[model samples]
Target: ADIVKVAIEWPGAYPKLMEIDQKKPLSAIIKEVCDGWSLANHEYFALQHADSSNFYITEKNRNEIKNGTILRLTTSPAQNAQQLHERIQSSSMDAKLEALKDLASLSRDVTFAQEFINLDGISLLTQMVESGTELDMLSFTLTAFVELMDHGIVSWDTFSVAFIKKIASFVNKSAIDISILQRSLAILESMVLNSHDLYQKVAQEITIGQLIPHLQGSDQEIQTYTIAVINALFLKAPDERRQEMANILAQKQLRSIILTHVIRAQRAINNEMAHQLYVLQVLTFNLLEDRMMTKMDPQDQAQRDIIFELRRIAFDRDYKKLGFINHVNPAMDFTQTPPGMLALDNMLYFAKHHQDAYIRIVLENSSREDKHECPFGRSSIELTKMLCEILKVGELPSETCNDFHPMFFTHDRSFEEFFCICIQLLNKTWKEMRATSEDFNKVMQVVKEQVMRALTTKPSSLDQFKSKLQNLSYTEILKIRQSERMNQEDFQSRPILELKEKIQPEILELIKQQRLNRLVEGTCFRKLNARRRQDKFWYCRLSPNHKVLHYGDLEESPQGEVPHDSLQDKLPVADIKAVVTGKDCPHNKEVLELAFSILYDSNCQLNFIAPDKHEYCIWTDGLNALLGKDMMSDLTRNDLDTLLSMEIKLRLLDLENIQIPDAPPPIPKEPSNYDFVYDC
Candidate 1:
């Protein structure tokens, strides 16, 4: 019953009105429209909007023709070019900009562009670029110019010399807008890529000197466009002309700028930066210069040390010399990225939770006897076993100081990246040792030594640190190990004293602000040393910095403000050694569900039970990471884990389902002392 009356238009014929069936299939309707006319072929004619010749091809599209719509049946869809040329010739600046913008887009179709050029569109666009006063108009005209030329119908000779020179002027203009400069470079990339005459003219007017400055501009967009153009000067040129452009671009100043940009790209570590770095490197590869001028050892005074040259970029001091000062965005945090654990996982989680993935990769490789996980990607039984062992090291035995993480601590990198650092170092030295499976323990020990040794060298990135590791010899490893042990052996817990004592209040305050964002606070059943503690009610919260636990008996939970001075017992968090639970919680036949004891370093226990399992998980889930409990070996997990964390990790599965939730706190960046550890 539903239908639409559509008026059909066709050239050299009177309008014919027809009713379109709303639910009819698209093909049958088009065939039905062409039936009575005896059209040459039904496929050639299509139903289109009366005012425009775009054929409606979908059922939804056909339904959209309103009840009185005037549609056309045309053998060819005609989009007029004259209307656009009229607007460009007479409209205001705003309308002129829009016309050229549409014109540029329409020129993407070959047929559209062929007629556009035949209509003298390029002549008009070239004139606009030649004398255009407004930047937007010039940019749009250049855009349309590039688009028209892209169809390959327009010859390089058809473009005037004044137009080419005008674009070259934009390239050389002092303090030109980056947008215009970007489009200008786009034209030259096409020109030099397509024609030798255009390339020669461009090289004459826009010297390599003029463009090199833009690469040094430090703006990513312009640098990218400028590189694309320089890439062209090498592309497709004859053998004689190729090195001609190459030698000029190889000038010391330009080469130094290229290397500088490469370093900046890596330091940036942004995905976009990495792709640019590859493209930039590709361009460098294309520009074949004397493999010798910069290569000659001015620093070593003609003394050849080829290995040192290979390892130079990785050196810590080399980065210092590079002085990577800018970041794409320096203040970004890694919580949204890798480099830290989940806030919930960090609770009572020990080094084991973080090391599991690194260790898993190693053992799996060892089992398969494969090189898949090895950083140098080599088949080495000893290296795999060694990697399994090196990752066990950590800051304060808790920061996950594995060979991967210490370098990880130095840079904002995923643990997976630092994993490569350990691998690359081994591939270099494992050749000398030719390490075996039984040689595993010795390699493991030295990998640990080399890493902390590199930490002492204070290399800032994987490159610098791996660079430092390349110098590892039995002499260097033992030299550093001797100093490390005598230099006061590690006291996994002592750093807490140092951290608590050494940090300025400002940073501690910032850490507290971060912790408060994730701190769990709720009402619970708490039994202190006070007698007849049954039926006693309390609200508890871990202090803002997570350095203290505050519990006070009160009506219900008051979230933001803890009653610090009133009816409260605030326990110092650092003194906490274990979280005791169930039968082990100081009562033989303990009658409690969702009950746990908080054990202190002094051997006292305070027991608490949540009002329900919802609060139970939310509380204990909050407790795990703080104690570094889930981080130990099976033995340590039992030795240290049998306490509060056992129930915590057991609940790990259902806690979130039964419940759950890095917004916690960031310790000081790099070389964190245990003194940063929370204690009174």
Candidate 2:
């Protein structure tokens, strides 16, 4: 076999050099190149000879192949542009339609996009749209135009006035399918967003008057697309131009349509419908008030009324009363505001600026007996909560004022006037209920008990109550209180003797050595001998805080106290870095043991077998959790060693006192001899 060198070029990538057998077919070479570049689906690309201008079909071989040949890779459309173009220009409608669809689909790639435009595909598409009788051909032609524009290969100038007028005409054609209308609207929207020149032309030609009727159309998709086109038109237009469009919409009573939907959105059963209505209202609000307000003449009462009605419905106190509580639904998503939240914003604004008026309204509604009925109860609760939140009051008004009593005297009195109003309202409601129902009696008892507790337990309230005591003077009462406080302090200072088990001195020393803070003692199976045959129960205490595990043959009393003498082994949990489980254990076959070797001391390992699987899981999980906790601390092997050595040195130093050594003599003789010679 002879090796031939070839250079392959990939789009948007550096060329790769390959050495292959000259006897291999061109298809084989193409596959090898594709494989090298990690390019998948080779059927979508073809290799073309740069010199011969011939494509390499997979079934054919290039007999003219030679060493050092360069091959260029062409994508689907670029490779088949000539054939597709011929078919596009064919007289047969089916041929032209098929070719256009394929070209449109392939134009998604930028390389193919450039090639399609270079082949004058845009002129052919415009001709088909102008003369074609078939809707599919027209649709595909328009879609191809959209795709080309999306790839920036075509511009709005390519679309003639006749073609745009034909698109705008589709909006009013009841005979045309919704699909055609949607595509037409989508094309117009894209043109509007992409090019300002096209936007001005489309706006001047396509009036909003024609689009407003479709807003009432039965098809939801048509409605959505129409609104989207309208939104885009208004959004991308200049302020002056947008105001003109909004004025036309206002003349057509767009405000009524917006408000009707906003009201309906408040009661919409399905969340999606509600969401759509809310979106439309928001768009309308932006158009009518947010954008068009400044552009309108100041004395335009109709426009002023529209703004007023928008605010009236948006902030209507009645609608707010019903829908305000719905704002707190846990299922509600906060990413987008629900349309009903407009009412919530209105209520908050009204409450913020007109506190007195809002508070009076809440008190009046909540106090009436007839208003305490079904819907009103829930509404009152919402309003009362809102009022509490706004006034910075710490308490929510209850049916009987029982919950408010504690906060009434204890919270900041800055809102005392508001609190008194709520209390008066509650008093009125409670009196009416007391006259009609026996349940009020039980509520009154609970309220009285709460009030008594508040007076007694609260320090300030207790002092106030004591001041009203007529039998005791203020000075005498203060002295008596001081004496009682001192007696309570004395009782806390006293230490009680322990009647239970105490930790042994040896175990305490061990705890000090390990820096143990708390110990958890439990039973685990310990190997009786090194032969891995049998095991015995030993009490184990694992302390994660101190990074130590201690176990021994311990005995515990029925009172749940373990003697410290039983603790014999103390191992650092930090030293056990890895926990070996299952068959990985050295003694796994003989016993259900988990093993771990100490760091820097692999020869020493502590092995324990659980009594059962439950015990094994508990021990493994506990040990792993403890090991993970201890690893976060700065306790490494070196640090531990240093600490132990320091302790040992301190202990040794305490054992003896050595005398201090004398200071060494200075080396001044050489200097003195030189100085004395200079002086002589």
Candidate 3:
């Protein structure tokens, strides 16, 4: 049924009002009102532009102001309107120039701000720029463009590429006219540094190419602005884009320009700028690292060597030296030190975690079978020895040393390498001194004693000792090996073999003792041992007539003289909910279902001994199930503790509700010497 209602009112009021029905979609009515208002133009437009007295400011004007209307208009859809654009264009030029000033004020209204690019208004602005008639119009238009750029414009490409290129040409045509060029550079710089993704899209279009060439221009301002643009571009670009820029630089042989700026600006300066420079340097390094890996020709050995050398020269000592000495100037000296050692620590860390993509490239191109091997490899041995000698020579901070960890025994790399390097350096030092000294043999004997005592005779493992060995010079390695061989010659025909064998037993013993000691201190002491014994079905009877549960259902038939049972026969405390007694009790089902299940009378029990000479029953299964019976018997308590704690999360179940008053006391929680071993 369609119900129609009619309203009758005074003719004057009726003529002023239109009917709106609730049954129609609200959006349709909204669109109709909007359409009416849009066409009604002058009524609402005048009301909106009034002195804030009309209708208390209409909803449209209030809403536009609230949502960054200026910025939105600067990037709005109507920005492309031809009629409004023509209004701006016609008014931009007049005798009084009052129209242009009015338009400029309207431009700041945040409503007309985006009209700078609207309906190809940039083309119109460019025309005005070309004529050189009203410099004020061009200047104000340029300011509007800068504000529009800052506000962030979308689809700005159509205007930017065409408009900027033309502006560049116009500036070039009138070289003496620096005003427009200066403003353009400022806008371009801001866009390059802080614009969103769309800004970069526009930039990649001929803007960068046009701007970068000016870096080599004669004017200092031009060069400064050019560098700023480039720096900002590189800084803002994503890692992938940075790589693209790097590739471009490498292709054009323009790396020196970027690197020189970065290397110069990396020290004490304006703190903020220094930070930016540091970030830029890191990005540049990563870019260079990628280029060195991907593009360097593998077949060119000399070139590969040169590139690696250059990388080493750029990164290693120069930065560190500069950091310490506060020297900002570049170095010229290229004297050889022990090769690779300078950056070896950082390189090893990178090798382990970084993709090894770059190192692999070096290997693929190198003549050497081992990419790691180099002319510097042999020199690294000497370097390590030098490190050791210096360790003893220096007056280091005692307070710093007091808080030191073993890893901190050497700087950057491991202590063993430092020790070995020191040995090598000491050998070299002694050799040079021996050339003039008559007491060379006596000096050598004392040096060997000091080296052996310092390198060995401590609780430190071979892992620690071996690090020192690795740094020893070849001459030192030969000397140490020769002395050991001589000491073993009297006991064995093969001195070297005997010496190695002798050392093996001692090293193995150290490893075992340490491992066992670690286990005892571990947290899994009870669970591991319990699990292990559960694996074994041991039948040793420690007490006479103690109850023993052999196979199953020991609880049902508590025979005389067997008062209890094996820990395994006792019900696991965790699985029980609440005990109930009746005909249908599940606990009784086991005995009824399986009779004669090999239950032993409780009397004899297995007891565990403690470090403090206390004995107590372990209320759990035999160890055989967890470790295998053979392993259960072999492992000491410490070993069991370590093994269990390594992976298991053990819970101490509450053994409540059981009525065994005679059961042994719970294990004590006390500290012991074994605490350090299984600490992890």
Candidate 4:
């Protein structure tokens, strides 16, 4: 075991393999080898590892001087490369391959790469790659080339154009060994990523379309490497490369390819390809976000179709879904991109088919004229308060109604029709006021009042709503707010009136109407009783607006004359969810007869026992009729759940749209914002 074969080297001498005695110290071994090689100044020489870049070994390192190694005779790399080059230039393929393999391993030291560069060693390896027929030989040569530049010391310029051509050819080959594909792609990725010139050459010479099949091929490795190369070409490389990749991405169906491949491959269940390909899939999406912008003239039906399809994706695609904090990045630029498309569809179609008021704006905006172009038709558009809130001043103005709630002042059509109408009105007000980005809040303030007056008029249809919106005057709006504030202040003023006509006369007339034996007015409940209180009577008076009913417990029994009492109860008509008969009541008791119940907001319940069946029937029929008429006349009927969900969906669409690279511009870029319609 003490005697083992070894290889040794020195400056200006051919490498020679010789046997060594491991028990013998390397200090003497160096001299022994030097003597064998007939070198001078044996005392000055040392033995070192060729691989570790002249790592000197002594007696304590005797184990490293194994049976065979390419050990450095001196620290000079020229010496290391010169001997390897001789083997590389030999006619024997096996020996050449072995020499290159050793050279590949040594090239990581950097000095050998530097030394190899000096010997013009790179030219021979490219020739091997370009002309080599054997798979093993080609693989060896590429591995060597990869390392030579692993240090980036070997300039890409050192490679002849043939190297890229050969590697790309190997990349295209269906039958090459996996290692050949791996090395070929490794070299391709390294060069294409780092050398712009080489990347340009690759773009010129390589057809990525050829490699796409490799991704489809059964070889999982080829697919991974192929995707990695494209990933670098599209993302990790230079701008021009990315730009060019965008063009190719549009010209081809890479999105569909990977999308289908994603499910078909089903590789994600247990393979690295799953995660990586998903990354590539999303990377492809970022490219999609950018390329469509390259097409100009969005007003052109072609551009419209492009934009329409894009909006369709946000609303229509599999991304109907996200993860964690409801956040998905790149895909879930949730904070931005998809919102644009959703709003655009809402506005675009909303206009394509709405009232003449919105139609004028949507169509004029769609018209091919310079004055009013569709927002998506251009590369970018100026921001309006409605698109999103900005720093200087914005967020939809909230006050008159206080926060936002679906109101009785409904829209004629679908939920989005009203949303679209509101958005159009916001912008209409925006341009009318000649507001700027800095003046967003001013526009919001103006638009808020316009919206208030339109809703307060309580039209039955969106068409009529817009009609009301059109006719609503600022003076009328101001008075309505004063009326609203005054009404609120009345609560604190302790006494309330403009005159008898303001409220008292209506009360007086209603009282007289009760004396006239009106169908249902005044102590209409002559005997009102609650299960909670056995001795109580209530007077029910429906307000003139039919907006609510006021009730109070009479302070004294009304034997023949109606007794007066403080108005202590107000039931918001809008708050009524359902009305039920006494037998239908959940909290009814055996003692309760002629009783009817009101259920509201899922959590509130009210029960009353009318004086007789005549009153019970009258009140139930009257209350139910009131609830029914209000609902029947109601437009835009989405519930809290449906109303809330569409917006949640809209946000998801934006989140999943594209991984926006811009400032989350709040629909700031292409594929940009709006309720533009659809609740979810």
Off by over 4 Å in 1: 1-79, 90-98, 101-114, 131-135, 150-160, 216-219, 238-247, 250-252, 258-276, 286-588, 591-680
lDDT of 1 at 296: 26
Residue-wise C-alpha lDDT for candidate 2, range 1-680, written one tens digit per residue? 66767777877877878886656775566677788788887766776555542434332344455788887766554557667667877888889779877666655545555677887777777666666664566666676677766777656677787777778777655537766787788888777877777777788777666776665655656556676677667667785565576667777766455344423334322343334444433443343232211233335566445434433433353322322223333112111222223223333444554455445554544334453322222332333333333322322112221111222222222123332333333334344444322343343333333233333442233234333322223234546765675444322422211111132233224433333322355555555353433224556666555466666663323555444435466776667766666555454354644432223256665556665655464455445445542321133333444444444345435533332122433666555445464554
In the range 1-680, model 3's lDDT, one tens digit per residue, is 22222221222232112243435542353344445434332222211222221122223343333311111101122432334355546743552244344434444443344545544555655565556553555556665455444545444443445555555454344343454666666655665555565355535553444554554444455555555555667667776777677567556544344334422334323333334333433444334233222332335566445534534542333222211111222121111232122323333333333324324422322343332222222222233333334343222222122111222222223443434433333445444444222444344444454445445433133355545544444356657875674444423434223334554444434434443333222111111133433422222222111222132111212352223344544422222222211222221333222111111234322222211111111111122211212221223354444433321212112322333223345888877666586567
Score residue 10 of candidate 4 by CA lDDT.
Answer: 63
Per-residue alpha-carbon lDDT of candidate 1 for residues 283-336, written as tens digits (9 for 90 to 100): 333332222112222244222232223123123122112111111211121122
Q: What tens digits encode model 4's per-residue C-alpha lDDT throughout 1-680?
A: 67877687767888877687777665577777778888766666656676654544555665656566777777345666887888986889789878877777677666557778777778888777788665466666777777777876656766778778888878876657778888888888788778778877876666767767666766667777777687656655554566576567646666456545644466642255544544553443343233222323334566456444543432331211200111222122212443344334444545456545454444444433343233321111212223222211212212131211122113222345655666666656655655444564555566666765565564645678778777765456677865575335432332221222253334433333332332235353534443455336666665766566676664345465354554455776768777776477675353366667878888778777776654554565555555643221111122222433343344435544344232323544664566557686
Off by over 4 Å in 4: 1-76, 133-135, 236-253, 259-282, 288-680
**How close is every model to the real structure, measured as TM-score?**
0.38, 0.37, 0.30, 0.38
lDDT of each: 0.53, 0.51, 0.38, 0.56
Residue 142, candidate 2: alpha-carbon lDDT: 70
353 Cα displacement, candidate 3 (Å): 30
Give the residue spans of candidate 3 off by over 4 A: 1-42, 46-88, 91-110, 114-119, 130-135, 149-154, 160-162, 170-179, 186-225, 232-283, 291-680
Best by TM-score: 4
Error of model 2, residue 213, in angstroms: 6.7
What order do candidates take by lDDT, descending?
4, 1, 2, 3
